[PDB]
Ligand binder design. Structure first.
Ligand code: AV0
Ligand code: AV0
Ligand code: Y01
Ligand code: Y01
Ligand code: Y01
Ligand code: ZN
Ligand code: ZN
Ligand code: ZN
Ligand code: ZN
Ligand code: ZN
Ligand code: ZN
Ligand code: ZN
Ligand code: ZN
Lengths: 318, 318
C-alpha cells in the first residue's frame, strides 16, 4: 500500500504545483483525480487500521467500522467540489483564453504520469484496481495528446512582429499596437482544446464517481439494502406461529455486508418463548440479515404495549 | 425562506460571474461562502419537506430524518473543497502576482453585498442567524476594504508612459525594453494584499465550519451522543434485580434528539418479564434514550443464547 502510496503522493505534489504554475486545466483535472486516488488509499489504510481491532469503544459502541464508507463518501464529494471549481475555471477560460506556457514540460509530466500508471499496473479483486489504473492512464494520455496537438499546431510567435490574432486579446495593448512583420498565429483549433477537453475530463470523472457517491450516501442514510426485500420479509414475519402481528420494524445496513434488524413482536403465551425466537432467528438468517434484536410485547388499540407516556412523539423513532 | 433564497442565489450568480471576470480571490471566497449559505438553506428546505410527511417507506424504513444532517455534512465538505481550491489559487498568486482589473466594479459589488447583508439583518433560534449574517457582513467588509485600499494606494501605469515595475513581470517585457519615469506606489501593500486577505478569509471560514463538520461526522458515524454516558448506563442496567448480565448493548443517535438503544438482556421467571421490561423502559427514559428494543434471552459457556449457525465473517457486530 505505502510502497505505491508514497510515489503517488509525491507525484501528485509535483504535478499539482507544476500544473497550476503552467495553468493548464486538463493537467489540473488529472492531478485532482490522482489526488482523489491517493486520498482513497489513505482512507482505505485508515479504515483497515481502525477495523483491525474494533471493540466496544467508550465513544463508539458499534466501533469505527463505517470509516471506509464515510471515507469513500468524503473522497467522492471532495472530488465533486474540486471538479466544480475546475469547471468554473474552464468557463472563465472560455471568457478569456490563455495560451499554454511551455509544451515541453507538459509533455514531460504527461509521459511521467503514463510511466507512473505503467508501474502501477504491475503492482475482480485486482481487476477493479487495474481498471482504475487504466482510467488514470487514459487521463494521462488525454493530457499527452492535448500537449501534442498544442505543440504541433500552435506556431505562435516569440518576436515583436504582429503575430497575435484578434481571437486572443493582445497583452498590454501590444504596446498601443506598436504605436512590424505580418504573421498569423495558429488556427482556430487551439487555445480552446485545453478547456473543451477538460470539460470532457470533468464530465467523465463525475459520471464515474456518481454511482459510488450515491451508494455511499444510501449506506450512510438509514436505507434498507436492495438485496433485502422489506415487503417479503414483513409478510413472512406475519405468517408465523404464535405471533399475532409485528410493528416497529427497522432494517438498515451498517457497513459492507453486516445488516442489523429491529422489530417488536407479541406472543399469546409467555410460557415456551424459546423455539419461537429461534424461528425468528432462522427466518431472518434465511434472508441476508444476520444480526437481529426482537423485543416481545407479551399479551388493545394501543400499537405497542411498551411506550413511555411522557414521550416526545418525535424522539420515539417513527 | 424562498424570498431570501432567490435574492441570495441571484446575487451569488452575479458575484461569482463578475469575480471570475475580474479575478479577485477575496471576492471569490466570499461568493463561495454565500454559495455555502444558500446551499444550506436549500438542504434545510428539502429536509423540512421530507420530514413533514415522514413515513416507513419501503426503501427507507426509518425515514429520511437524517436528510438535514447529511445536507449539513455535504455543505461543510463542499465548502472545504472549494476552500482548498482557494488555497491553491492563493499559493499561485504568491508565485505570480496579478493586479486587480477594475477597482470600481469591485467596490460596487462589495457595497452591494454589504446591502444584501443589511437586508438579511432586516429580515438562540434567531441569534444564530444574526451571528451568521454578521459574519457574512464581516466578510463583505473585508472584501470592500481590500477594494478600497487597492484603489487608493495603487498607482499602476495606464498610458504609454514609462513605468518601471520590478514587482510584477511586465507583459512582453514591455516591448522588449522598448526595442516620464513614473514609479508605482507601495507594491508590498497593494499586490500581495488580496491573496493574504483571501487566506485570512478562508482560514476563518475553515475555523467556523470545522465544528459543524465534526458534529455531523460524529452523528453519521454510529457514535454515542455526548449527553448520554454509556458506562453509567450499563452500570445501572447491570444493577437491576431482574437481569443478571447485559450484553450486546448498542446506542446511537438518529438525528437531532432521537436516540435508539439496543440490548440483549438475560432473565429468569418468564411469567414476570413485563415487570422487568417496565423497569428497563423507566431507566432508559431516565436518560435521553427514548426508543429501545430490549430483547430478553431467557434462560454461561455461550454469551448470547441466540446466534447465527455459521456467523460467517462475523458480520454481526461484536
Ligand atoms: C479524507 C478524510 C477521511 C476522514 C475519515 C475519518 C474517520 C475517523 C474519524 C475520527 C474522529 C472523528 C472526527 C474526524 C474529523 C476529520 C474529518 C475529515 C476532514 C477532512 C478535511 C473520531 O474518531 C476517533 O476514534 C478514536 C478511537 O480510538 C478516538 O481517538 C483516539 O485517537 C488516537 C488514535 O486512535 C488514540 O491514540 C487516542 O487515545 C484516542 O483519543 C476517538 O473516538 C476519535 O478521536 C476524530 O475525532
Ligand atoms: C453538490 C453535489 C451533490 C451530489 C449529491 C446529490 C444527492 C445524491 C443522493 C440522492 C438521493 C438521496 C437524497 C437525500 C437528500 C439530501 C441529499 C444531499 C443534498 C445536498 C445538496 C436521492 O434519493 C431519492 O430521491 C428521490 C427524489 O429525487 C426520491 O423519490 C421521490 O419520488 C417522488 C418525487 O419525485 C416523491 O413523491 C417520493 O415520495 C420519493 O420517493 C427517493 O425516494 C429517494 O430515495 C439518493 O439517491
Ligand atoms: C488532501 C487534503 C484534504 C488533506 C488531507 C489530510 C489527511 C491526511 C488528514 C485530514 C483529516 C485527518 C484526520 C483527522 C482526525 C484524526 C483523529 C486522530 O485521533 C486523535 O488522536 C484524536 C484526538 C482528539 O481530537 O481528541 C488521529 C488522526 C486522524 C484520523 C487524522 C488523520 C489524517 C487526516 C485524514
Ligand atoms: C457539461 C457541464 C455543464 C457539466 C454537466 C454536469 C451534469 C449535467 C452531469 C454530470 C454527471 C451527470 C450524471 C452522471 C450519471 C448519471 C446516472 C444515470 O443513470 C443512473 O441514475 C444510474 C446509472 C447506473 O448506475 O447504471 C442518470 C444520469 C446521471 C445522474 C447524470 C446526470 C447529469 C450529470 C449530473
Ligand atoms: C490556511 C492554511 C494554510 C492552513 C489551515 C489550517 C487549519 C486547518 C487549522 C489551523 C488552526 C486549526 C484549529 C486550531 C484549534 C482547534 C480547536 C480544537 O477544536 C475543539 O475545540 C475540539 C475540542 C473541544 O471539544 O473543545 C481542535 C480543532 C481546531 C478548531 C483546529 C481546526 C483546524 C485549524 C483551523
Ligand atoms: Zn484513478
Ligand atoms: Zn445469520
Ligand atoms: Zn412495540
Ligand atoms: Zn420517552
Ligand atoms: Zn420506529
Ligand atoms: Zn454566511
Ligand atoms: Zn444477546
Ligand atoms: Zn454488537
Amino acid at each position: 500500500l505505502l510502497c505505491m502510496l508514497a510515489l503517488t503522493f509525491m507525484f501528485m505534489v509535483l504535478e499539482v504545483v507544476v500544473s497550476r504554475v503552467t495553468s493548464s486545466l486538463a493537467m489540473l483535472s488529472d492531478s485532482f483525480h490522482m489526488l482523489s486516488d491517493v486520498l482513497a488509499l489513505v482512507v482505505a489504510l485508515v479504515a483497515e487500521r481502525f477495523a483491525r481491532r474494533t471493540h466496544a469503544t467508550q465513544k463508539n459502541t458499534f466501533g469505527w467500522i463505517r470509516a471506509e464508507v464515510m471515507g469513500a463518501l468524503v473522497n467522492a464529494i471532495f472530488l465533486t467540489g474540486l471538479c466544480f471549481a475546475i469547471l468554473l475555471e474552464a468557463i472563465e477560460r472560455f471568457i478569456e483564453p490563455h495560451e499554454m506556457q511551455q509544451p515541453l514540460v507538459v509533455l514531460g509530466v504527461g509521459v511521467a504520469g503514463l510511466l507512473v500508471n505503467v508501474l502501477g499496473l504491475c503492482l475482480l479483486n485486482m481487476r477493479g484496481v487495474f481498471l482504475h489504473v487504466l482510467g488514470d492512464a487514459l487521463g494521462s494520455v488525454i493530457v499527452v495528446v492535448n500537449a501534442l496537438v498544442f505543440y504541433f499546431s500552435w506556431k505562435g510567435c516569440s518576436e515583436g512582429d504582429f503575430c497575435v490574432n484578434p481571437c486572443f486579446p493582445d497583452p498590454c495593448k501590444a504596446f498601443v499596437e506598436i504605436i512590424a512583420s505580418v504573421y498569423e498565429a495558429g488556427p482556430c483549433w487551439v487555445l480552446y482544446l485545453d478547456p473543451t477537453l477538460c470539460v470532457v475530463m470533468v464530465c467523465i470523472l463525475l459520471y464515474t464517481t456518481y454511482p459510488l457517491l450515491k451508494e455511499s450516501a444510501l449506506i450512510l442514510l438509514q436505507t434498507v439494502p436492495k438485496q433485502i426485500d422489506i415487503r417479503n420479509l414483513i409478510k413472512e414475519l406475519r405468517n408465523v406461529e404464535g405471533v399475532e402481528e409485528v410493528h416497529e420494524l427497522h432494517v438498515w445496513q451498517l457497513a459492507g455486508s453486516r445488516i442489523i434488524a429491529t422489530a417488536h413482536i407479541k406472543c399469546e403465551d409467555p410460557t415456551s418463548y424459546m423455539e419461537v425466537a429461534k424461528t425468528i432467528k432462522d427466518v431472518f438468517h434465511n434472508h441476508g440479515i444476520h444480526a437481529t434484536t426482537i423485543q416481545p410485547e407479551f399479551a388493545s388499540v394501543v400499537p405497542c404495549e411498551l411506550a413511555c407516556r411522557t414521550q416526545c412523539a418525535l424522539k420515539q423513532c417513527c
